[PDB]
Scaffold this active site. Sequence first.
Site, PDB file in Angstrom:
ATOM      1  N   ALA A 147      -2.130 -10.984   5.988  1.00 13.40           N
ATOM      2  CA  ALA A 147      -2.246 -11.390   4.586  1.00 13.40           C
ATOM      3  C   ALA A 147      -3.644 -11.286   3.982  1.00 13.40           C
ATOM      4  O   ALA A 147      -3.799 -11.382   2.766  1.00 13.40           O
ATOM      5  CB  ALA A 147      -1.700 -12.807   4.405  1.00 13.40           C
TER       6      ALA A 147
ATOM      7  N   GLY B  23       0.813  -1.236   0.000  1.00 12.00           N
ATOM      8  CA  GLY B  23       0.000   0.000   0.000  1.00 12.00           C
ATOM      9  C   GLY B  23       0.839   1.276   0.000  1.00 12.00           C
ATOM     10  O   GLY B  23       1.938   1.287   0.547  1.00 12.00           O
TER      11      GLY B  23
ATOM     12  N   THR C 133      -9.436  11.166   8.176  1.00 15.83           N
ATOM     13  CA  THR C 133      -9.773  10.989   6.758  1.00 15.83           C
ATOM     14  C   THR C 133     -11.147  11.646   6.554  1.00 15.83           C
ATOM     15  O   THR C 133     -12.041  11.455   7.388  1.00 15.83           O
ATOM     16  CB  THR C 133      -9.707   9.485   6.372  1.00 15.83           C
ATOM     17  OG1 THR C 133      -8.377   8.999   6.615  1.00 15.83           O
ATOM     18  CG2 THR C 133     -10.044   9.256   4.897  1.00 15.83           C
TER      19      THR C 133
ATOM     20  N   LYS D 140     -11.013   3.675   9.532  1.00 18.49           N
ATOM     21  CA  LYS D 140     -11.558   3.523   8.174  1.00 18.49           C
ATOM     22  C   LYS D 140     -11.224   2.108   7.685  1.00 18.49           C
ATOM     23  O   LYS D 140     -10.279   1.490   8.187  1.00 18.49           O
ATOM     24  CB  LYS D 140     -10.993   4.592   7.216  1.00 18.49           C
ATOM     25  CG  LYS D 140      -9.471   4.563   7.060  1.00 18.49           C
ATOM     26  CD  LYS D 140      -8.960   5.731   6.212  1.00 18.49           C
ATOM     27  CE  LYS D 140      -7.437   5.787   6.236  1.00 18.49           C
ATOM     28  NZ  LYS D 140      -6.861   6.900   5.403  1.00 18.49           N
TER      29      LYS D 140
ATOM     30  N   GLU E 263      -9.693   1.080   5.146  1.00  9.33           N
ATOM     31  CA  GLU E 263      -8.340   1.019   4.583  1.00  9.33           C
ATOM     32  C   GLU E 263      -7.277   0.752   5.647  1.00  9.33           C
ATOM     33  O   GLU E 263      -6.201   0.234   5.328  1.00  9.33           O
ATOM     34  CB  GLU E 263      -7.981   2.330   3.849  1.00  9.33           C
ATOM     35  CG  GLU E 263      -8.855   2.656   2.632  1.00  9.33           C
ATOM     36  CD  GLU E 263     -10.077   3.514   2.942  1.00  9.33           C
ATOM     37  OE1 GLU E 263     -10.822   3.223   3.915  1.00  9.33           O
ATOM     38  OE2 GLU E 263     -10.326   4.458   2.157  1.00  9.33           O
ATOM     39  N   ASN E 264      -7.577   1.131   6.893  1.00 12.06           N
ATOM     40  CA  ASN E 264      -6.674   0.900   8.039  1.00 12.06           C
ATOM     41  C   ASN E 264      -7.040  -0.335   8.872  1.00 12.06           C
ATOM     42  O   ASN E 264      -6.537  -0.507   9.986  1.00 12.06           O
ATOM     43  CB  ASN E 264      -6.645   2.120   8.964  1.00 12.06           C
ATOM     44  CG  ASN E 264      -5.927   3.312   8.357  1.00 12.06           C
ATOM     45  OD1 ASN E 264      -5.196   3.188   7.372  1.00 12.06           O
ATOM     46  ND2 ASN E 264      -6.117   4.486   8.969  1.00 12.06           N
TER      47      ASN E 264
ATOM     48  N   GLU F 165      -7.018  -5.460   3.088  1.00 11.97           N
ATOM     49  CA  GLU F 165      -7.803  -4.416   3.747  1.00 11.97           C
ATOM     50  C   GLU F 165      -9.278  -4.805   3.773  1.00 11.97           C
ATOM     51  O   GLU F 165      -9.777  -5.359   2.803  1.00 11.97           O
ATOM     52  CB  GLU F 165      -7.697  -3.107   2.972  1.00 11.97           C
ATOM     53  CG  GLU F 165      -6.316  -2.477   2.872  1.00 11.97           C
ATOM     54  CD  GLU F 165      -6.297  -1.286   1.927  1.00 11.97           C
ATOM     55  OE1 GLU F 165      -7.371  -0.905   1.410  1.00 11.97           O
ATOM     56  OE2 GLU F 165      -5.209  -0.725   1.702  1.00 11.97           O
TER      57      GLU F 165
ATOM     58  N   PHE G 110       2.531   9.768   1.760  1.00 10.81           N
ATOM     59  CA  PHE G 110       3.933   9.766   2.211  1.00 10.81           C
ATOM     60  C   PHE G 110       4.363   8.574   3.095  1.00 10.81           C
ATOM     61  O   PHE G 110       5.368   8.655   3.813  1.00 10.81           O
ATOM     62  CB  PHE G 110       4.245  11.079   2.940  1.00 10.81           C
ATOM     63  CG  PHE G 110       3.617  11.176   4.302  1.00 10.81           C
ATOM     64  CD1 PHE G 110       4.390  11.021   5.447  1.00 10.81           C
ATOM     65  CD2 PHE G 110       2.249  11.411   4.444  1.00 10.81           C
ATOM     66  CE1 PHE G 110       3.814  11.107   6.704  1.00 10.81           C
ATOM     67  CE2 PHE G 110       1.669  11.503   5.699  1.00 10.81           C
ATOM     68  CZ  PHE G 110       2.450  11.349   6.829  1.00 10.81           C
TER      69      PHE G 110
HETATM   70  N1  LIG Z   1       0.723  -5.073   9.056  1.00  5.06           N
HETATM   71  C1  LIG Z   1       0.265  -4.976   7.784  1.00  5.06           C
HETATM   72  N2  LIG Z   1       0.056  -6.079   7.012  1.00  5.06           N
HETATM   73  C2  LIG Z   1      -0.391  -5.993   5.734  1.00  5.06           C
HETATM   74  N3  LIG Z   1      -0.678  -4.815   5.132  1.00  5.06           N
HETATM   75  C3  LIG Z   1      -0.519  -3.636   5.803  1.00  5.06           C
HETATM   76  C4  LIG Z   1      -0.028  -3.647   7.196  1.00  5.06           C
HETATM   77  N4  LIG Z   1       0.025  -2.359   7.615  1.00  5.06           N
HETATM   78  C5  LIG Z   1      -0.393  -1.588   6.566  1.00  5.06           C
HETATM   79  N5  LIG Z   1      -0.727  -2.351   5.500  1.00  5.06           N
HETATM   80  C6  LIG Z   1      -1.198  -1.885   4.168  1.00  5.06           C
HETATM   81  O1  LIG Z   1      -0.482  -0.688   3.863  1.00  5.06           O
HETATM   82  C7  LIG Z   1      -1.406   0.399   3.738  1.00  5.06           C
HETATM   83  C8  LIG Z   1      -0.764   1.666   4.264  1.00  5.06           C
HETATM   84  O2  LIG Z   1      -0.396   1.499   5.636  1.00  5.06           O
HETATM   85  P1  LIG Z   1      -0.806   2.715   6.612  1.00  5.06           P
HETATM   86  O3  LIG Z   1      -0.113   2.510   7.935  1.00  5.06           O
HETATM   87  O4  LIG Z   1      -2.290   2.848   6.515  1.00  5.06           O
HETATM   88  O5  LIG Z   1      -0.034   3.906   5.860  1.00  5.06           O
HETATM   89  P2  LIG Z   1      -0.394   5.484   5.883  1.00  5.06           P
HETATM   90  O6  LIG Z   1       0.687   6.183   4.942  1.00  5.06           O
HETATM   91  O7  LIG Z   1      -0.331   6.019   7.248  1.00  5.06           O
HETATM   92  N6  LIG Z   1      -1.947   5.593   5.114  1.00  5.06           N
HETATM   93  P3  LIG Z   1      -3.078   6.865   5.472  1.00  5.06           P
HETATM   94  O8  LIG Z   1      -2.515   7.727   6.674  1.00  5.06           O
HETATM   95  O9  LIG Z   1      -4.429   6.112   5.850  1.00  5.06           O
HETATM   96  O10 LIG Z   1      -3.240   7.655   4.214  1.00  5.06           O
HETATM   97  C9  LIG Z   1      -2.652  -0.047   4.488  1.00  5.06           C
HETATM   98  O11 LIG Z   1      -3.842   0.611   4.044  1.00  5.06           O
HETATM   99  C10 LIG Z   1      -2.674  -1.527   4.168  1.00  5.06           C
HETATM  100  O12 LIG Z   1      -3.126  -1.748   2.825  1.00  5.06           O
HETATM  101 MG   LIG Z   2      -1.808   6.930   8.339  1.00  8.39          MG
HETATM  102 MG   LIG Z   3      -3.716   4.232   6.473  1.00 10.69          MG
END
Ligand SMILES: Nc1ncnc2c1ncn2[C@@H]1O[C@H](COP(=O)(O)OP(=O)(O)NP(=O)(O)O)[C@@H](O)[C@H]1O
Ligand SMILES: [Mg+2]
Ligand SMILES: [Mg+2]
Lengths: 19, 337
Positions: B111, B37, B188, B155, B157-158, B114, B41
């Site tokens: 695995a 994902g 979000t 959300k 996605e998280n 989301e 940033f």
């Molecule tokens: N432990 C994990 N195992 C598998 N996939 C993961 C894991 N952690 C994160 N992901 C994937 O990676 C994506 C991004 O991780 P995330 O910690 O949400 O990043 P972020 O940059 O903070 N996103 P956002 O702040 O919601 O715009 C998630 O939406 C999942 O698709």
């Molecule tokens: Mg985030």
């Molecule tokens: Mg996220």
Amino acid sequence: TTYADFIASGRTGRRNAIH
Amino acid sequence: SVKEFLAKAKEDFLKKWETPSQNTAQLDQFDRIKTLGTGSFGRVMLVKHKESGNHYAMKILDKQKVVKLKQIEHTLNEKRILQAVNFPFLVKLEFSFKDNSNLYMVMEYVAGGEMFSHLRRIGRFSEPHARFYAAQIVLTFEYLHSLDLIYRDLKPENLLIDQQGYIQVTDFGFAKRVKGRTWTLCGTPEYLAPEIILSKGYNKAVDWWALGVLIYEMAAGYPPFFADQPIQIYEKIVSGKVRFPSHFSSDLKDLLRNLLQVDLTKRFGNLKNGVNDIKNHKWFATTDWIAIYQRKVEAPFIPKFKGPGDTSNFDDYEEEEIAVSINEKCGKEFTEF
Ligand SMILES: Nc1ncnc2c1ncn2[C@@H]1O[C@H](COP(=O)(O)OP(=O)(O)NP(=O)(O)O)[C@@H](O)[C@H]1O
Ligand SMILES: [Mg+2]
Ligand SMILES: [Mg+2]
């Protein structure tokens, strides 16, 4: 339908956090 | 007892909060396989730990990008809190470290993908399906809030689905330990409480609002407030008018009216009775809270699993070269990471 309206909208994909 | 469990949980948390784990692996100990994902940033990659053969999910944050987006304190919050928590529905941080260019957080690889991708594909979840997941968020917030933590980015996605069909909450990017109120505009758009949008000062009640949005979206297939642009979403949120699909049950609508409640003196989760107003609501009447906690409840579905490092449940992303620098960037800003 509200569902059709959503599906046609620009925010049906993964949404990024804002800050 | 819940009080006894939470008292022990707080003791556990505080020890790690006060003395965080630091520098517990290094980059060349992993092979980087594929991106799971990408955001504005952060990049999360499937990696393989060379010595153990285990797969993990590695969150990579470019220090320079963090600084530019004014996320230094948030990123410190993120790692300090994630390394200190312990709950059945919170993703486990296994290692963390930094190099000249980046910050790294190495989590257990979940695995199943989301919740987001399964939700969009199937359209919507049945009410019992939505309830199964919602129960886990309720217990998770009970745990987090008891530790004076606010989560601030609920959300689909998280939220990841594990091999048993249970939720693993990821992304502690906006998690914050705060007793009083706080003011940062973050989250979000679809999930922001009115008080965030209106710059009012806010507390853990925003997580309960966000739960309302999550339950609605799970059960409806779409959010309660949607539009093409964030500003239009915010207007709808502040408006405090919610329409429910006709297939929504009477109990579901009632619970959502109490969560998606603009009045803080009336919002469930925030009243004298706290989390029990939610736990005891008619919509959750069939929910066995202890059985959910103990993971003894049968999951609505189990994700497909082809192999230990299979990414089938995740979208593909364009790969990018990892940032590398001969000199250390932003050393002082991230000394504690
Ligand atoms: N432990 C994990 N195992 C598998 N996939 C993961 C894991 N952690 C994160 N992901 C994937 O990676 C994506 C991004 O991780 P995330 O910690 O949400 O990043 P972020 O940059 O903070 N996103 P956002 O702040 O919601 O715009 C998630 O939406 C999942 O698709
Ligand atoms: Mg985030
Ligand atoms: Mg996220």
